[PDB]
């Protein structure tokens, strides 16, 4: 009919959603968790020092075995490291040196990456020839690839610079489902423990929940005031944290449909680059733009410790599947492990 | 305490040597970033010098060049402009004829104003503090022909001078250079694009050589 009525209905729906979220807010998390003992100080030291890359590292991901981890840098080469021996398993020379995202399949057979180039290059690590070759080139995106994660052994979902997301099939190499709910550049992407849901953050200061089978937006959060740089799913699959430039992390829940609490400090004025949860979820490690990484309590929201092993902006952060250690990457061209 | 990991360590050392060699070969080539409003100017510059990121390799006087064109991206630069922090110099292209022509969705905005704003934003960026800029003023003959009838005061009301080429050219050069704030750290290399070839490449080579000299002198503390 007319745009006036549509905008009025949208505003009414937003007001109704806000009223529902306000009414659902019975109690807070800080007041209840006050009866829990504090985690105290945690002292983590650099157990290993990886000095293979020669450029700024931007992304990394742990494998299912909790021993192998892939890393991407601006030099245009991917390196598979052995955490126990720091050995280089394979060196994948990338055709595009502007890589800023990488993924490690759960089966340990294929690895993906991307960046300014809209084409996502897939690589197989268990070829009979013994040399890593390009498995398939997934093209079709308009903006730069920000994050990618292997949904399964044959399916992969990635986010592009544009305000859309797509799910690719390695068998055919076509967009099985295209999401068009975001209104800004997508920067983060994380899969849920059940593999049926996944969350993604964009520069529109909001985080939305998507469904793989349904292919529609399940929920939308608007607790942040700036762009979201990272997102991680809670181990239980009912919550997820997000990092933004406003230096105020916010935890959300899929069942409450709102922000539980926030993590921030006065001296902390720099933005967040990466966020990850421990195996139990009690510790929330987040890497900032500063040369240090802080550890936050998921329940008490206190600085349990700080990591001053790097001398440059922290770019990525990933905890092992077994929670035995955590690796932190930075633009200093080094990748260290903490525990 | 090693039985079979000896071959693994040997492979690791070989891979490290290969990566170090590739890095020594990678850093051996000069890297440049191509920016500027308008696609015709950048296209003409790339043609004279010979989708996503567009990669181009061309050697001149035994010096390698890696031209980076991000005009086809069309996205918020705030989240990926920092990737070019290590570039040597940024080539900014702007057509002088734009002083009169405007974009489609202008709403009382001149294309020259948008070009100047983009130049100021890219110059005063925190990631390009020590990165030089090479400004090329394209469409020389077209601009010289338009100024014969269309005056320059249409875009710059404060301009008070003769509607000639030399005066207007110098005024535009000053206006583009005035946008620079780091007069001590920055160094803008301005040049008027010519129709004949083998001229812009020479200026680019000279500017790259000067920037390399200045960088090597600053790294030692003598500049």
């Amino acid at each position, epitope marked *: 009919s007319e745009l006036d009525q549509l905008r009025q209905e949208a505003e009414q729906l937003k007001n109704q959603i806000r009223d529902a979220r306000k009414a659902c807010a019975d109690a807070t998390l800080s007041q209840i968790t006050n009866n829990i003992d504090p985690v105290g100080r945690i002292q983590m030291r650099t157990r290993r020092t990886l000095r293979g890359h020669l450029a700024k590292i931007y992304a990394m991901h742990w494998g299912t075995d909790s021993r192998l981890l892939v890393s991407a840098s601006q030099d245009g080469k991917l390196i598979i490291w052995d955490s126990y021996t720091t050995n280089k*398993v394979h060196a994948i020379p990338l055709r595009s040196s502007w890589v800023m995202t990488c993924a490690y399949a759960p089966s340990g057979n294929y690895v993906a990456c991307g960046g300014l180039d809209n084409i996502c290059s897939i690589y197989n690590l268990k070829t*009979r*020839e*013994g040399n890593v070759r390009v498995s398939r080139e997934l093209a079709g995106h308009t903006g730069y690839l920000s994050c990618c994660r292997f949904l399964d052994d044959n399916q992969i979902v990635t986010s592009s610079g544009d305000t859309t997301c797509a799910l690719w099939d390695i068998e055919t190499g076509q967009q099985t489902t295209t999401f068009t709910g975001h209104t800004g550049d997508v920067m983060s992407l994380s899969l849920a423990p059940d593999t049926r849901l996944f969350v993604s953050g964009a520069c529109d200061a909001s985080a939305k929940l998507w469904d793989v089978r349904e292919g529609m937006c399940r929920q939308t959060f608007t607790g942040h005031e700036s762009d979201i740089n990272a997102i991680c799913f809670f181990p239980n699959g009912n919550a997820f944290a997000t990092g933004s430039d406003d230096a105020t992390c916010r935890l959300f829940d899929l069942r409450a449909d709102q922000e539980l609490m926030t993590y921030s400090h006065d001296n902390i004025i720099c933005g967040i680059t990466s966020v990850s949860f421990s195996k139990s979820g009690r510790l929330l490690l987040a890497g900032y733009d500063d040369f240090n990484c802080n550890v936050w309590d998921a329940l008490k929201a206190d600085r349990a410790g700080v990591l001053a092993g790097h001398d440059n902006r922290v770019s990525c952060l990933g905890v092992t599947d077994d929670g035995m250690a955590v690796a932190t990457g930075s633009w200093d061209s080094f990748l260290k492990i903490w525990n | 305490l090693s039985a*079979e*990991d000896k071959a693994a360590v*040997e*492979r690791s050392k*070989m891979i490290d040597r290969n990566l170090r060699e590739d890095g020594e070969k990678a850093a051996r080539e000069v890297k440049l970033l191509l920016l500027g409003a308008g696609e015709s100017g950048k296209s003409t510059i790339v043609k004279q010098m010979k989708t996503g990121i567009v990669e181009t390799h061309f050697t001149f006087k035994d010096l390698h060049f890696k031209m980076f064109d991000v005009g086809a991206q069309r996205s918020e630069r705030k989240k990926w402009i920092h990737c070019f922090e290590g570039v040597t110099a940024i080539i900014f292209c702007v057509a002088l004829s734009d002083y009169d022509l405007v974009l489609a969705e202008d709403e009382e905005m001149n294309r020259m104003h948008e070009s100047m704003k983009l130049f100021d934003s890219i110059c005063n960026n925190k990631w390009f503090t020590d990165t030089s800029i090479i400004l090329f003023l394209n469409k020389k003959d077209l601009f010289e022909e338009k100024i014969k009838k269309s005056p320059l005061t249409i875009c710059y009301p404060e301009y008070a001078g003769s509607n000639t080429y030399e005066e207007a050219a110098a005024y535009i050069q000053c206006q583009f250079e005035d946008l620079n704030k780091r007069k001590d750290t920055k160094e803008i290399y301005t040049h008027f694009t010519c129709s004949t070839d083998t001229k812009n490449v020479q200026f680019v080579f000279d500017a790259v050589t000067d920037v390399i000299i200045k960088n090597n002198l600053k790294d030692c503390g003598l500049f």
Partner: single-chain antibody, 233 residues
Framework: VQLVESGGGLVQPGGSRKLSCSASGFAFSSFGMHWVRQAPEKGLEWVAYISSGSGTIYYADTVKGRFTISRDDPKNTLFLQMTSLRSEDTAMYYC??????????????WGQGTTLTVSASADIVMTQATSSVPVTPGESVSISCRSSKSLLHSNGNTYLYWFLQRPGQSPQLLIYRMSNLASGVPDRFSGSGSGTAFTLTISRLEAEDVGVYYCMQHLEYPLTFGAGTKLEL
């Protein structure tokens, strides 16, 4: 993936021969090469080994210093120069590739081999309980062996590799480290071990299993193969 070996034939005592093998289908530079000798009335036997970077070249005691191995990276051809060949060296030689990394499967591909006929201590000892056992299709069989030293290394890995040599074909890797099966091997094969004693269980035996099963240890460079267990239908 194919390895065409050449340079066999007859040779008089004390002579010299240069065995050549051209690699194709894979990166010859990245893979290391192994020479496995097998006499007409004996089992497999390790000869020499060369790494990818042509470094750390080790030879066996029986051929220590007498033979030498070389390779050509740009040519992708393996060379084995033998001098002062003895009568005891009369046997067929096999060429095997190997790549070492976390999760690798060394000794996965075995070449054809060329027959070489000569005209007229402290190493790991592998001993098998039985050399020949009768088998029938559809039944389940097990092969057991023993080692003079515990192969279980401090890192938890056990350097034990099993091979099967069918009549008229080269050996094939069945199970490496007793935990991961080689590519293309049916899942009906299973292996176990206790640090010193090892066993190989083959369920649902088929005519394709008729052959001689060999065992190999890789904890020490002086490899040593077992006596070999032959399964007769």
């Amino acid at each position: 993936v194919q390895l065409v070996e050449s340079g066999g034939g007859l040779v008089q005592p004390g002579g010299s021969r240069k065995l050549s093998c051209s690699a194709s289908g894979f990166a010859f530079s990245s893979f290391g090469m192994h020479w496995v000798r097998q006499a007409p009335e004996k089992g497999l036997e390790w000869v020499a080994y060369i790494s990818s970077g042509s470094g750390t070249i080790y030879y066996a005691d029986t051929v220590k210093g007498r033979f030498t191995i070389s390779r050509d990276d740009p040519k992708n051809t393996l060379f084995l120069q033998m001098t002062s060949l003895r009568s005891e060296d009369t046997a067929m030689y096999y060429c095997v590739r190997s790549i070492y990394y976390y999760g690798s499967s060394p000794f996965d591909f075995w070449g054809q081999g060329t027959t070489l006929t000569v005209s007229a201590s402290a190493d790991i000892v592998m001993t098998q309980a039985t050399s020949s056992v009768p088998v029938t299709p559809g039944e389940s069989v097990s092969i057991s062996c023993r080692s003079s030293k515990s192969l279980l290394h401090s890192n938890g890995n056990t350097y034990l590799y099993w091979f099967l040599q069918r009549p008229g074909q080269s050996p094939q890797l069945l199970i490496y480290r007793m935990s991961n099966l080689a590519s293309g091997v049916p899942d009906r094969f299973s292996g176990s071990g206790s640090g010193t004693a090892f066993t190989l269980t083959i369920s649902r035996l088929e005519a394709e299993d008729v052959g001689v099963y060999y065992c190999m240890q890789h904890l020490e460079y002086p490899l040593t193969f077992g006596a070999g267990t032959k399964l007769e239908l």
